[PDB]
Amino acid sequence: TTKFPKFSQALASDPTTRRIWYGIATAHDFETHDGMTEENLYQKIFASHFGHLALIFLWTSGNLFHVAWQGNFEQWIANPLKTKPLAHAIWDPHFGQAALKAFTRGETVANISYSGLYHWWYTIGLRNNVELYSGALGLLVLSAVFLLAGWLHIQPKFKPSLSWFKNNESRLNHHLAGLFGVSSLAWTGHLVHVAIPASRGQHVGWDNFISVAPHPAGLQPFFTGNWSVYAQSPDSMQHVFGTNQGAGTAILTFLGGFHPQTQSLWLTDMAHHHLAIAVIFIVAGHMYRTNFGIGHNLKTILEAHRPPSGRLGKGHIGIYQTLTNSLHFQLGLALACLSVVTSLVAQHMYAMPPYAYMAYDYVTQAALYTHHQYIAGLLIVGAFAHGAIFFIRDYDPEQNQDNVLARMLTHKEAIISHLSWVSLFLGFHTLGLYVHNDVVVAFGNPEKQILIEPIFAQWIQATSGKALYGFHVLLSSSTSNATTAAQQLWLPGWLEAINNESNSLFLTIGPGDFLVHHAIALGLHTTTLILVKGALDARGSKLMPDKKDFGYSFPCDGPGRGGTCDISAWDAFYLAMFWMLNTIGWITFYWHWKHLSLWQGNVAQFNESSTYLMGWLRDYLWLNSSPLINGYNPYGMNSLSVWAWMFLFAHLVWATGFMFLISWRGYWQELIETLAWAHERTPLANLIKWKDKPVALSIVQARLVGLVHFTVGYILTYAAFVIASTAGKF
Amino acid sequence: QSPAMPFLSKPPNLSPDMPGYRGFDPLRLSDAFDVNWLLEGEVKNGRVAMLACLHFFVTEYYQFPFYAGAPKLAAPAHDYFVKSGAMIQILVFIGFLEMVLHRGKVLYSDMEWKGRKPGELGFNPLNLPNDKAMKDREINNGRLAMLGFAGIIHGEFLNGKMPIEQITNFQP
Amino acid sequence: MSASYLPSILVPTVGLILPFATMAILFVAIEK
């Protein structure tokens, strides 16, 4: 604790540049820090959590403040379909005059926003820059508060005990009823009091919200139980959003489908959704036994779920202790569920646009889908990484004897071998069918293509009421008890939306959609295979039966026993990242091309070209690259210059990653030795001495540095393309 | 315990020997930073603000003949003499003085106080009495000048009005 | 914007002055 890093004496004693790198890379692995106790670990994490939350509120503050100060929110409200929202001003003294003009948006040099903040803020009732700014100040206070809380809870009297941190039943009650439930109840309050009034051109703010009742009938219906009153007189189908013209009085409805003007969910549906959700969460958070002698014990629930056959051995006996005592098990489950939520957000927000006019902001739609699927992809890789770490660091076989978790390890070869089978099957046949299609199309015979109708997915569209395919099942059947039950509620609005081919609600699907879905299945299964193999072999294999003794991350076990490069569970994380990027690539390529085709009104292009891979390269990548790569050229530059420059930058970063991934350490260490030699023997230069002996990056470090360049290049390349291709085209 | 704020404990790193000590440090910046640096920073920010307050007071019934036809308002003046190329000569000259007075050790890491208490830069040509309560008189004038200067420039930005015109009979 | 001078002060600060100060501070911190 007398040289960086203070938390590792083993690193601090390292006389080489490795000390600095490993200091940075291990700074947050609190468990492995010198003299770390379980109590200090939890308390450090809790305080770090306050830091991270404060960061989220400062970032959000920044976005509100920049739009308030430098944006065109007020001008965008006036004309949301034509006006481009501004992110923030550019001040760059490297700009030539031509670049200042190219990026001039009105009277300001500025970036256009593709984050959808204007659409969201406008939908939730924000109407002017002073309201945004008030938001910014409000969130600076929230940041400051969390920084105070963070600071308080690492002061001796305010450090919570380990028993506090392992109070599962209490945290679940509060998080369900309070964090989810009451937040959703309070948010309902915002929609009913502020957002819905704002949608009907009625200003409700801090100035008047005490006096201005969000419904004419007040709270008399709510206490008399005459709740139908709140659903009467919804906004007409002629309602001009932000105005009273065709406005209703309803605050809670079940209209289904879209506001025809804003092509977004009804605010009164979203109000009533959140009321329903709030109640479900408040009830759900009264499940678990705290201090009042009612509710469930989570251990008692788990221990009871042992099938009497003995087919799951001891069932869930021991799982309670295993989960409660492992932060990595907890982080794994949390990342797994959050990943799924992030993917569901991506899928549901494009299909059922919540925000006024954002269906028309094509760049924002594409940006948001892509952003969230890459976050979801990172989260699920992380979930499995912490699954693997859990197995090495926290899993005790003796405490999990013959339970569901121990039984996974018992048949790991059955699991891995079957994931291998499904991956091989999907890979052979998906690549096979695409290559069949490419060859017969290349030979001028597209009628010889294997074009398998996605009839199961088409049948599901028909169950939700899509008439197009000729199936008359459930909601697409007039006589179904499913149809008749919903006819007076959401079904008219929903059927209108689902049978409209202009929106993204249950897009029409054909053979193109069949093939890419099997590509997506291949990617999910293979990424899963790598991560699961990583987790189930983390503790040991036939090649390294004592792997758990070497920990999550180590270079290898040397060239003996045939050679052991990339044997650590960390190496499975490293390999899975490539497959995650590849898979999210296929997903987001598919989303983007399907939407470009829809938005152009040339669905036929996607339908015909998507069934062979040259179609993707030519009609998606090559065709849509033109606006991007002409951001600058010999004749001049335009506002896409920054995406053109970023695009090349990202290709460079991607390719630089290959150096670290392909060329390994020994080459570099030998080269550095000659440079050290040269420096010491060069006059004048040799008066200057390094304090840290320069060495080549470590074996694992280069995998990480290579993967970061690869990942950054991968993401920035696609970001520049998906933005510039969409912005350039519309 | 703190003389200035008895309800708060005394700032430990502060001492009564230091010039202008009231034990006033509610934020405890004397815990965050070396007192010798803060002390040096205080007197300097003072000495600079002192000259800044005089600058505004003199250039108002005068403005040196050879620079005549320049606005005496803070921001317009700054913009004029930067365009002129006078402020860049002053910047390098102040940069020169900073290196000369501190004798190379200019960094918070480097700056040292071997045989000099904070503020003692070895500038006493008239040879007036230093080691006494005269340091507290410099500090009080410096502290007042720092708030003074802040009051001038904010008055200059608010209603575009002269320092001496403000104290006649005006309200917004 | 209203305070259109601010980017001329803060972008150099965040872009040149503060990164040099931070690099200098971290250099001393990791070499002592």
């Binding site: 450090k44 305080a47 770090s48 306050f50 830091g51 404060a54 400062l58 403040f65 308030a68 100060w69 820059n129 002073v130 700014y133 910014a136 100040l137 600076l140 206070v141 940041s143 400051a144 920084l147 105070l148 963070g150 600071w151 690492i154 002061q155 | 934020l27 965050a32 930005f157 | 914007m1 209203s2 305070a3 601010l6």
Partner: peptide, 28 residues
């Protein structure tokens, strides 16, 4: 439109967050 005063009020509150952030950072 956001006034000079509003931008400077934001900056002092951001300064306060800076102070409280350094306080937390120094302790963690």
């Amino acid at each position: 439109m956001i006034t000079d005063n509003q931008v400077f009020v934001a900056l002092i509150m951001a300064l306060v967050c800076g102070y409280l952030a350094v306080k937390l950072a120094a302790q963690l």
